[PDB]
Assembly symmetry: D2
Homo-oligomer: 292 residues x 4
């Protein structure tokens, strides 16, 4: 549920840029069959930025219905205004989602005290479990371990998706929080190293197209079989990197289409179709992973 | 109009975080009397992040109403979804604003080609002049000179608010664009240098509280009297730095309240109240500028 | 010998700035008694920068004599001119040192190919085992994993001191080198995390004053008792950080003096005596480690 | 003398890496004929890193001998040990050099107070004018404006070669120092901007191969004809960038050899031969400058 290989699932779109229900169902059945632990619905990879809140709720509610009780669904609920974060979260109260993935406010660059106040007010207007999400290179803002320590004392703040790719953060945070506070990597290329240091799983872009390898990799890691998990990581490492050859989720949507998992690789502006040179790059990395 | 000291005006709020019309009137009267070139309404310093589009449009319309033809108004219209950017611009068509200040998509980190498609599409669906706005430390994305040069060929893309504080950008942009494209600094601490290199003015936080000195400094810079403009800038320099001692607009709203220009220094979460130590750093910057 | 807690030993000096033999002997006996695995003599911490090559050789030869066969001694042999690196290394041929610690050329910023050529020529004019040393924040140059992979094929290039504090490098490098190529951390604050990922030890500043704790910490780590190694790391973490409160080795020399381990804390310009505020900082961190 | 286009001259070498006197003569004749203000002998571009102090002193004495009173010579005299810095300066006392170019200690990362003590001590033991040299990306250390302002009060510390390319530094230094302190750019690509902001000239790599254009560009900048200087700079700009496509002085030595100004493009390890792709990037920059 909050550990192992968690997919940050693309929002597959028809050519008009609206959610494609048939492609979404294909994707969800693929995750149930592959062993994926949970689905993060309309996170970064799911283009939260270009969906209005109604669209975004529709996709979450559609994903939960299609999951049909077979796989837990976590909703992306980030907003950079605290009143908007609370209001988006309330759409999902008493819904069936098992928890929220909520990013540090982006753009407005709050202090650590404003981060603390933002997440505490969100946690207060819900019963859902909250996973903090730190991704400074997107938000302009870095949620520090000390602040995570304060927030971990709030009853329903239960974990963090740490996407800095800064491995020292796993044990800085673990030292400050209780033993059942979940630590998840948001950086595919370092996620196995992150679990080896004591993280509990990964919210993954790579799991979109390599769900079975990823689930297998996190099970081995959780059991302590790191040399064995690493054989899989090496096969996947070209994808861990090349799925960011162009801005995520441009490469992974193309990879989904190439694999027959979705009908189209359409995205919303300002995301642009994959270039010819990106196609070639992602094709080669899919081949190396044994997927094509 | 698009030149000189342009203020990125605060959105003054009452204690419930609602726009305070009386305070906004006082600020606008102050700018008209002090020689400010234009007002940027609901930019970054105006808390665009925490106003929904409807409140956003009310603040701009209220500003135009209060301004009463006495001073031009530019609306911030940035959004990280192209469709939203376009649709927000439409609310301002025929409003009386003289142009729009439109930021690079934040958070989703599009490519240069996606930035190009983003601003081209926005520019296509309006007659209003467009000013591109680059501030990578907020958005996670850096609009490069080459892309500015391509976008400058669009009839109604008329300039750029360059907030990197990277001064090599002035002449890299300038050699790629026509002589009438306006180059505006978005970084108060380096804005006089930017103008000395060829920039045409500043969209400024300092000007909220030092309107007259800013206006004189930018007129002296425009006429080439850099040594004379530098004397005023040295006296405003603690303000240029200390209005950012805590996240902008926290220090500048406190400063406006301390001068009596606005009734309260209230902000919206995730912006938090100024700390005592911040109060003292800002008061000392205000005194060094001769404002208290 | 090339694993466990390896001390980067200070060069204790009398008040004239020359090596103090009695303080050096005190330090070496302290390491033999504490369980320290090996001594790096005239590395960074030993002020290689301010010793001329004769002075530097004298200190190495003096350290080896005092060690008297009880503890292996590794010589710092870095130089940014390849002919100087070869000539310094030759001073130690047939000497009793067990190997060299050789830093990437500093200042002149060579390419990866120049790094390759520099270390390969050094390795070729010696029989001593070579440990590569990467510390970009001092040298301006970053020896990448791919280049380490090439150099690991040279017979007597046997290991790397990785001082970036970038943990992803442990497994990037391990993937490329054979299983007996040694990986040592050059960053105290992350060295336990570095061993947990599969590193074999640490060349340590902290071991100068906490040699027993450090030796114990690396033995637990090597045996897989990470939760137990981490109890020690937490007690030492204020020292891991505060020993860089001022430029290394200014704080550790002061700490050596405060502990009675050396007679004076004299350094050579451009290193300057510890400030009063640094003293207080290092004193508190020594107290937290249970040492004072 | 301390103003205008100053060349950081290459040390031309034969195939065995020894100074090539005939080539050095040709370069010096070229600078005297082309209007270059002064020659920096054995700076960074002169491979100070790989000449021992004795070879270093020979190259400077040979340069003064060849110059024969026709053009002033400044010696690089940097060292990361204060005692060595002092002792190298003594070799140049009464030599005929007009001053010294002395870099911030590299590698050992002293504090601002240690930089202050370092340069003050060097300045104390000579009558020669001293030019401070800041280049953090080589040295790991950044000499800050405040420390420059303190050092400028020393009688014979007369200027700074500022190589950060951070243009805000020009007026931060200038307001802290007397009007006669010289500000020199050490970054060719931003040197015209630096001069437009108030700097007095450039210690330049480009000037090795574009001496006349550089000299005219710096005289036009000194007289305030920035638009005229900008036309020449636009034509030298590919050279400003591409003389750094591989580590400087690799591209500029190849360029001198391609022009026939020196007999060979040999460097000392760890500098390596130019790659074929580098050859082609540099040839194209040379052609764009009109030099081939
Ligand atoms: K609650
Ligand atoms: K909790
Ligand atoms: K239009
Ligand atoms: K235009
Ligand atoms: K050998
Ligand atoms: K080897
Ligand atoms: K003197
Ligand atoms: K002076």
């Amino acid at each position: 549920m909050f550990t192992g290989s968690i997919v940050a699932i693309v929002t597959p779109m028809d050519e008009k840029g609206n959610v494609c229900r048939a492609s979404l169902k294909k994707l969800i059945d693929y995750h149930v069959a592959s062993g994926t632990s949970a689905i993060v619905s309309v996170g970064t990879t799911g283009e939260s930025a270009t969906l209005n809140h109604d669209e975004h709720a529709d996709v979450v509610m559609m994903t939960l219905d299609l999951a049909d009780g077979r796989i837990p669904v976590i909703a992306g609920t980030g907003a950079n205004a605290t009143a908007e974060a609370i209001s988006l979260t309330q759409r999902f109260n008493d819904s069936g989602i098992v928890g929220c993935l909520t990013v540090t406010p982006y753009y407005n660059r709050p202090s650590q005290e404003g981060l603390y106040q933002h997440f505490k007010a969100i946690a207060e207007h819900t019963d859902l479990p909250q996973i903090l999400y730190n991704v400074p290179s997107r938000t302009g803002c870095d949620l520090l371990p000390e602040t995570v320590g304060r927030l971990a004392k709030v009853k329903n703040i239960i974990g963090i998706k740490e996407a800095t790719g800064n491995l020292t953060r796993v044990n800085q945070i673990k030292e400050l929080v209780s033993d059942d506070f979940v630590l998840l990597s948001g950086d595919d290329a370092s996620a196995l190293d992150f679990m080896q240091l004591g993280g509990h799983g990964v919210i993954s872009v790579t799991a979109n197209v390599a769900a079975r390898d990823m689930a297998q990799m996190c099970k081995l890691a959780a059991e302590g079989h790191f040399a064995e998990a690493r054989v899989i990581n090496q096969r996947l490492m070209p994808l861990h990197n090349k799925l960011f050859v162009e801005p995520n989720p441009i490469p992974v949507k193309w990879a989904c289409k190439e694999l027959g998992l979705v009908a189209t690789d359409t995205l919303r502006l300002p995301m642009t179709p994959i270039t010819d040179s990106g196609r070639e790059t992602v094709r080669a990395a899919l081949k190396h992973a044994g997927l094509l």
